[PDB]
Design an enzyme around this catalytic site. Structure first.
Site, PDB file in Angstrom:
ATOM      1  N   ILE A  32       0.878  -1.209   0.000  1.00 36.01           N
ATOM      2  CA  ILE A  32       0.000   0.000   0.000  1.00 36.01           C
ATOM      3  C   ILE A  32       0.899   1.239   0.000  1.00 36.01           C
ATOM      4  CG2 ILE A  32      -2.036  -1.093   1.025  1.00 36.01           C
ATOM      5  CD1 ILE A  32      -1.100   0.398   3.712  1.00 36.01           C
ATOM      6  N   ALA A  33       9.713   7.383   0.760  1.00 30.01           N
ATOM      7  CA  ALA A  33      11.034   7.768   1.315  1.00 30.01           C
ATOM      8  C   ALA A  33      11.224   7.149   2.706  1.00 30.01           C
ATOM      9  CB  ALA A  33      11.163   9.272   1.361  1.00 30.01           C
ATOM     10  N   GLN A  34      10.170   7.149   3.535  1.00 27.56           N
ATOM     11  CA  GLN A  34      10.162   6.571   4.910  1.00 27.56           C
ATOM     12  C   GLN A  34      10.440   5.062   4.832  1.00 27.56           C
ATOM     13  N   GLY A  35       9.822   4.374   3.866  1.00 24.44           N
ATOM     14  CA  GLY A  35      10.011   2.933   3.608  1.00 24.44           C
ATOM     15  C   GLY A  35       8.803   2.322   2.921  1.00 24.44           C
ATOM     16  N   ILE A  36       8.806   1.000   2.747  1.00 26.30           N
ATOM     17  CA  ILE A  36       7.703   0.239   2.088  1.00 26.30           C
ATOM     18  C   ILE A  36       6.696  -0.170   3.169  1.00 26.30           C
ATOM     19  CG2 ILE A  36       7.171  -1.537   0.383  1.00 26.30           C
ATOM     20  CD1 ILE A  36       9.481   0.539  -0.332  1.00 26.30           C
ATOM     21  N   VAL A  37       5.399  -0.071   2.856  1.00 26.24           N
ATOM     22  CA  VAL A  37       4.262  -0.344   3.783  1.00 26.24           C
ATOM     23  C   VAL A  37       3.342  -1.376   3.129  1.00 26.24           C
ATOM     24  CG1 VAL A  37       2.340   0.677   5.089  1.00 26.24           C
ATOM     25  CG2 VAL A  37       4.408   2.022   4.670  1.00 26.24           C
ATOM     26  N   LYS A  52       5.283  -1.661   8.152  1.00 29.68           N
ATOM     27  CA  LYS A  52       6.256  -0.738   7.519  1.00 29.68           C
ATOM     28  C   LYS A  52       7.665  -1.253   7.808  1.00 29.68           C
ATOM     29  CE  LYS A  52       5.992   3.755   8.481  1.00 29.68           C
ATOM     30  NZ  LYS A  52       6.870   4.682   9.234  1.00 29.68           N
ATOM     31  N   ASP A 143      -4.681  19.511  14.529  1.00 24.20           N
ATOM     32  CA  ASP A 143      -5.238  19.219  13.181  1.00 24.20           C
ATOM     33  C   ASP A 143      -6.399  18.215  13.257  1.00 24.20           C
ATOM     34  OD1 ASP A 143      -5.055  19.847  10.388  1.00 24.20           O
ATOM     35  OD2 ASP A 143      -4.265  17.809  10.054  1.00 24.20           O
TER      36      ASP A 143
END
Length: 334
Positions: A32, A33-37, A52, A143
């Site tokens: 489904i 830059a930080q990594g693959i999820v 993740k 938020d």
């Protein structure tokens, strides 16, 4: 004494440019830059989860920062009313060999659903529990909006994010600086929207957002305006004056449930709470603690949810220090 297999043994599945090596408990993995999820099914919990992979997060200062903050922040903030960190694991069995970190998150309308006082007050109670826990871990959400809150069919509520203008408090709109109770203004906006069936403060632009506030709630006090930067005060003073509309006119009895004698009392309670959350001056706005004790809300009060203590309050290293710091955080999850 044999060790639990679903919780201790790994399988590999290939996904894009990387081997996903996960505990056996996590099944039917789909990307489904930080990594693959990957989305997955946790067979132990019986729920959908997001897995993740962070590959060599310690290999870069900026990646190490992200990884270490995310691990410690997500650990601080775990609560039944917050999309929480369920598991952290590494396939590698020592500090020397340590490469990869897997984070497991819970994977997750009701505005326009016909609710009664029981369900509305429960949804609000849960929002407030989630915000209190965040605040106790030194995090102000800032938020909160309908599109980062999820409700299950059983009316269990979770906040999705903790790091549009319709839900932002006046002190933020005017850039005054803000405290925890910015989040109370947002809860007020969502409560108003649930009852009235529209956005309460729907500015066409950032200037009009202020107009919608004063048009309905009236020009704020001399004390509030005295607190503004002189340039902001001058604008706010020069706006047309508005007396404000009574909450009995903004939110009439008949748009709340009106069936029983209990419903009539709960409607006065609901509007009272609403009149204490939608207050321009944050010095006069109800706190999260007082809101959880409000008669409309406090019928749900359970210390286990409302006083659920955070494991810790959230507040330049060598590559090997970052590695050690990250690994020790993973090892806390056994």
């Amino acid at each position: 004494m044999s060790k639990s297999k679903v919780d201790n043994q790994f399988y590999s599945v290939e996904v894009a440019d990387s081997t996903f090596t996960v505990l056996k408990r996590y099944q039917q993995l789909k990307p489904i830059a930080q990594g693959i999820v990957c989305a997955a099914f946790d067979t132990v919990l019986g729920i959908n989860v997001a897995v993740k992979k962070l590959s060599r997060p310690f290999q870069n200062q900026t990646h190490a920062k992200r990884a270490y903050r995310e691990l410690v922040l997500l650990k601080c903030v775990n609560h039944k009313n917050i999309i929480s960190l369920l598991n952290v694991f590494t396939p590698q069995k020592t500090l020397e060999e340590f490469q990869d970190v897997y984070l497991v998150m819970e994977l997750m309308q009701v505005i326009h659903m016909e609710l009664d006082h029981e369900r509305m007050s429960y949804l609000l109670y849960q929002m407030l529990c989630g915000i209190k826990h965040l605040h106790s871990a030194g995090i102000i959400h800032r938020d909160l909006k309908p599109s980062n809150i999820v409700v299950k069919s059983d009316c269990t509520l979770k906040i999705l994010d903790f790091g549009t203008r319709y839900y932002r408090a006046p002190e933020v709109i005017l850039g005054m600086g803000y405290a925890a109770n910015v989040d109370i203004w947002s809860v007020g906006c969502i409560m108003g929207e649930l009852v009235k069936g529209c956005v309460i403060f729907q500015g066409t632009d950032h200037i009009d957002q202020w107009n919608k506030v004063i048009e309905q709630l009236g020009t704020p006090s001399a004390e509030f305006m005295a607190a503004l930067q002189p340039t902001v005060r001058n604008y706010v003073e020069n706006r047309p004056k508005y007396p404000g509309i009574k909450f009995e006119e903004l939110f009439p009895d008949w748009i709340f449930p009106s069936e029983s004698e209990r419903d009539k009392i709960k409607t006065s309670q609901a509007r009272d709470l609403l009149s204490k959350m939608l207050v321009i001056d944050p010095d006069k706005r109800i706190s999260v603690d007082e809101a959880l004790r409000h008669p409309y809300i406090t019928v749900w009060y359970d210390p286990a949810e409302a006083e659920a203590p955070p494991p810790q309050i959230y507040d330049e290293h060598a590559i090997e220090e970052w590695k050690e710091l990250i690994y020790k955080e993973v090892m806390d999850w056994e």
